[PDB]
């Protein structure tokens, strides 16, 4: 059975010819008698062997590349994922009910690509770039690969520009940066998308204010969501005007599993146009926990062996190569940036889940949203003891950095005494004074939905709480007390605070003067 005597059998050893001389003139009239059932032989095209569950096994396709767009004869696109010795495993970009056994598969020649450019700015596309908003095809646009590698060490620079989100629980405690990847992680219905929508809405308020190059172009990637939630979100972005700077990639729950797998890469390539041209991008991978489930479906049906929670082994590389494309480029590459907000949903607060611990180790910061802080009135439900940021200083407002340093510090003294509030001894006026002030700082960070705050109005509202001017206010009406602090304080103190960037001591006098001129209705 060894291959030495088996390849020796290539040499002729027949020693008789009473079949070779007989059937050679008998074979061609026998093949021609059944040639109605012969499909024509295939070499560089493809032919479907088996199709099912969104996976086509394709015979032929000799010269296809790995990860290459193929096209079936019914018009539906595919992607050659695992090139095996006798067939090609193709994931189907759509419904596999139009594919039969014996359909011709056509190689398109190109690796998978999406339209990128200024023409995508304002459109709702699917997970491959085709517009689903019903506004015609994409004009003023060009094609770019979805699998661009991340910029390396020599291409990047340090994250120094802020990119405020408009949520003062974020912008004071967990400051985002301009090329920073920050995770928004929490349970179901804890306000994950809210924190990300308030970031996109706040960029529209800032893009009509900054000189043409600090403008931030948002991309919302809606993976696995239902289609009516996405339409409920374009309606919010159009009535706000945020849809002028926003692209929306939406591979919904009815789409195929390779469309939801590819939509974070499709949306990142559209957001990489602004990073690679000197502009600034902001991408939200909403339900990145749903991309890994879509990628798990393809690999289990490509018969790749499962791992932790039946996920593929390379599911860390699924999210690490996606998020590392969010960078801040150097001056020789334009100076542009791209900051990512991936969203991971946990199950019953289990942070120790498999996909959850991967993206925590990939991203810079975390925004933890707990469902028990959500029902205590704290909205956004930010867990301050768990939400960290890698940049810390030099990526927030310099005026906020003076007044939020004594907020992150003084909220730690509030949590260290909350495990000592069942006895009620409250000795030596220390554990009771910080329990009165720390309760007045968590009510400061509470804010509404779809109404982000400018950073000059955030660094004045928390100026008024870490310092005096709110010491004799009840903890039930601080949320209405800032409407005195924002409106009744003379609004030219915000213009000089926005233009300076820090709280100058000439302005520290007027911020202490005009905060005594206001009458707070707390009584």
């Amino acid at each position: 059975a060894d291959a030495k005597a088996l390849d020796e059998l290539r040499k002729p050893k027949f020693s008789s010819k009473y079949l070779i001389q007989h059937v050679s003139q008998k074979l061609i009239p026998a093949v021609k008698e059944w040639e109605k059932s012969y499909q024509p032989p295939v070499i560089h095209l493809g032919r479907v062997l088996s199709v099912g569950d969104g996976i086509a096994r394709v015979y032929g396709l000799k010269s296809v590349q790995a990860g290459e767009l193929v096209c079936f004869d019914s018009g539906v696109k595919g992607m050659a994922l695992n090139l095996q010795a006798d067939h090609v495993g193709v994931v189907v970009f759509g419904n596999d009910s139009v594919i039969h056994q014996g359909d011709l598969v056509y190689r398109t020649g190109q690796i998978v690509n999406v339209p990128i450019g200024p023409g995508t700015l304002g459109r709702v596309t699917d997970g491959l770039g085709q517009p689903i908003d019903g506004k015609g095809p994409l004009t003023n646009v060009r094609s770019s690969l979805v699998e661009v590698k991340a910029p390396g060490i020599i291409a990047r620079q340090s994250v120094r520009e802020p990119l405020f989100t408009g949520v003062k629980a974020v912008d004071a405690l967990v400051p985002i940066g301009r090329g920073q990847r920050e995770l928004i992680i929490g349970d179901r219905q804890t306000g994950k998308t809210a924190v990300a929508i308030d970031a996109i809405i706040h960029q529209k308020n800032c893009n009509e204010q900054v000189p043409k190059a600090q403008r931030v172009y948002c991309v919302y990637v809606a993976v696995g969501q239902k289609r009516s939630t996405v339409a409920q979100l374009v309606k919010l972005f159009t009535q706000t005007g945020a849809m002028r700077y926003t692209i929306m990639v939406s591979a919904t729950a009815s789409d195929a599993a390779p469309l939801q797998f590819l939509a974070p890469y499709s949306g990142c390539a559209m957001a990489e146009y602004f990073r690679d041209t000197g502009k600034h991008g902001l991408i939200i991978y909403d339900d990145l926990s749903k991309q890994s489930v879509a990628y798990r479906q393809m690999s289990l049906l490509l018969r790749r062996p499962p791992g932790r929670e039946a996920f593929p082994g390379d599911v860390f590389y699924l999210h690490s190569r996606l998020l590392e494309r969010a960078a801040k480029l150097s001056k020789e590459l334009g100076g542009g940036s791209l900051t990512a907000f991936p969203v991971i949903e946990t199950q019953a607060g289990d942070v120790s889940a498999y996909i959850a611990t991967n993206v925590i180790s990939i991203t810079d910061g975390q925004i933890f949203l707990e469902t028990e802080l959500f029902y205590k009135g704290i909205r956004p439900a930010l867990n301050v003891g768990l939400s960290v940021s890698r940049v810390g200083s030099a990526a927030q407002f310099p005026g906020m950095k003076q007044v939020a340093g004594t907020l992150k510090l003084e909220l730690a003294q509030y949590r260290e005494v909350a495990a000592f509030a069942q006895f009620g001894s409250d000795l030596d006026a220390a554990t009771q004074y910080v329990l009165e002030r720390g309760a007045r700082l968590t009510e400061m960070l509470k804010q509404k939905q779809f109404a982000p705050i400018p950073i000059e109005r955030q660094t004045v509202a928390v100026y008024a709480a870490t310092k005096g001017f709110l010491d004799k206010v009840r903890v039930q009406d601080i949320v209405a007390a800032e409407e005195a602090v924002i409106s009744q304080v003379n609004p030219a103190v915000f213009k000089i605070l926005k233009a300076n960037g820090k709280i100058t001591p000439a302005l520290d006098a007027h911020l202490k003067a005009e905060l005594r001129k206001v009458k707070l209705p707390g009584a």
Partner: protein, 539 residues
């Protein structure tokens, strides 16, 4: 002569050879690829087919693409020419400054040093960190593990170990960035231009650190081999140069994780929690090469990420046996604001021995761990009672241990860019005597949080001077303060007038450089001849 691509499933390529298969661990080059694709032979499949792992992405690979054999494993440049350079997994310069001018390129695959060429001497590597140098002192020539989850401070701790030790070392260092963020690989590169550890241009040879980077965007073949690439540079400075080396490996966990991402595609059924069946011998094959021989020395500091703060996970639990020192960073210490967040009990070193560091350093180290374990057993009854009836013998062991938890914290030189206070270097004799006074009871005179974020014992003693000045402030509230306007304060309307005019061009900068090409509404495919045609109108 050469081989051809038989099968591409993810990052794992099957290459078939018509006679003369390459060896296992040998390097293969793929001919005709867009970039330089390097395959390392993982196994022999059996029907004249080898199975490989790719060092770059396998997108674009064609079945039948020509693959040549280099006849050797992955060889990288080593020597003085790699100092002050950033290297790839395969030895390419990714710092965009010429080629790497290094002689005698070395294979990244060798076996461990033998049992006879092992050193047994134990000299203390003084760090400057008073939780490291007191409770789990490091060993020069030994192996240090910085355990801890995500966000507890492994990279900041390994950055303070660089500017304390690797700057005042004299010998060469090697940073091996294995599967980490490219942002912090750029932050390490840029602040070693400023500190002078890496010099560029004609003074390149005066550099003291070789960078080898295999970060998170790389495929799992490159992440699984870049820890051998940086170790090969450290093994050249140990063996041939005879020097003392500092090998900093950020997240050796990513070496074990990258071998797990290819393990099921190499045809291995999985072991426990989800790692490869070869988890203890792939990690043990790497860690035993990082030793101090009789030729030279390697002092290795390795960050070890524990998944979800679980020290019982088998990838950090396998690393514990390979380490002389162990710095377990805890999230519970970090959430109290204590930095570096070193667990004072869970951290262990081979140097914590009275025959090595002396019975005076040893007894104050065990005395701190005694009072800190007693505080951990008293916090059960404090939350039920209140700590007011403990008759001042257990209230003294609470008040002394709470001073010790603050005094184990320290400002770092690399952490002043996000904290504000400058870092402190504490000497070895200055922290043994500082922790003796809190233990024997010299410094109950000082308040409890005066020990927080200081250096020497003469800094807490002067922080209690500042803390009792500033609480003797805030006594006057009438006048002669900044809030009166007639001193130097302009009017709020005049202050607005010094705002410089910023302009807005209202066009968002999009019509100036873009090549808006035409995208076909039709789909365009290739026929049997390879020629571009429209899709045939037949379903």
């Amino acid at each position: 002569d050469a081989g051809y691509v038989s099968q591409v499933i993810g990052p794992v390529v099957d290459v078939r050879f018509d006679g003369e298969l390459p060896s296992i661990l040998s390097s293969l080059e793929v001919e005709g690829h867009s970039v330089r694709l390097v395959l390392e032979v993982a196994q022999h499949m059996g029907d004249n087919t080898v199975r490989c792992i790719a060092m770059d992405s396998t997108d674009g690979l064609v079945r039948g693409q020509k693959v040549v054999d280099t006849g050797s494993p992955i060889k990288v440049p080593v020597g003085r020419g790699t100092l002050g350079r950033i290297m790839n997994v395969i030895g390419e310069p990714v710092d965009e400054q010429g080629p790497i001018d290094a002689a005698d390129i070395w294979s990244i695959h060798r076996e461990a040093p033998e049992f006879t060429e092992q050193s047994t001497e134990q000299e203390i590597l003084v760090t400057g960190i008073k939780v490291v140098d007191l409770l789990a002192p490091y060993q020069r020539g030994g192996k240090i593990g910085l355990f801890g989850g995500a966000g507890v401070g492994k990279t900041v701790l390994i950055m303070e170990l660089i500017n304390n030790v690797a700057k005042a070392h004299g010998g060469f260092s090697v940073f091996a960035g294995v599967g980490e963020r490219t942002r912090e690989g750029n932050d390490l590169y840029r602040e070693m231009i400023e500190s002078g550890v890496i010099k560029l241009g004609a003074e390149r040879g005066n550099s003291k650190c070789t960078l080898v980077y295999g970060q998170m965007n790389e495929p799992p073949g490159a992440r699984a081999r870049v820890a051998l690439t940086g170790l090969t540079v450290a093994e050249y400075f140990r063996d041939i140069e005879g020097q003392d080396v500092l090998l900093f490996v950020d997240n050796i966990f990513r070496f074990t994780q990258a071998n797990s991402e290819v393990s099921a595609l190499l045809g291995r059924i999985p072991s426990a929690v989800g790692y490869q069946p070869t988890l203890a011998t792939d990690l043990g094959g790497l860690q035993e090469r990082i030793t101090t021989t009789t030729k030279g020395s390697i002092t290795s500091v390795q960050a070890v990420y524990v998944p979800a703060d679980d020290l019982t996970d088998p990838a950090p639990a396998t690393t514990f046996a390979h380490l002389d020192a162990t710095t377990v960073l805890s999230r519970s210490i970090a959430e109290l604001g204590i930095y570096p967040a070193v667990d004072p009990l869970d951290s262990t070193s081979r140097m914590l021995n009275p025959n090595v560091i002396g019975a005076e350093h040893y007894n104050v180290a065990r005395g701190v761990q005694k009072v800190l374990q007693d505080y951990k057993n008293l916090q059960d009854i404090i939350a039920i009672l209140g700590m007011d009836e403990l008759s001042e013998e257990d209230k003294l062991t609470v008040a002394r241990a709470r001073k010790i938890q603050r005094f184990l914290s320290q400002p770092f030189q690399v952490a002043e860019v996000f904290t504000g206070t400058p870092g402190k270097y504490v000497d070895l004799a200055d922290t043994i005597s500082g922790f003796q006074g809190v233990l024997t009871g010299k410094y109950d005179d000082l308040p409890e949080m005066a020990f927080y974020m200081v250096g020497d014992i003469k800094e807490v003693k002067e922080k209690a001077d500042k803390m009792a000045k500033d609480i003797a402030s805030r006594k006057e509230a009438d006048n002669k303060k900044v809030s009166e306007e007639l001193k130097d304060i302009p009017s709020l309307d005049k202050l607005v007038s010094e705002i410089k005019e910023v302009v807005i061009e209202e066009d968002d900068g999009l019509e100036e450089d873009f090549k808006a090409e035409a995208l076909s509404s039709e789909t365009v495919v290739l026929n049997e001849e390879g020629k571009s045609v429209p899709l045939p109108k037949k379903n």
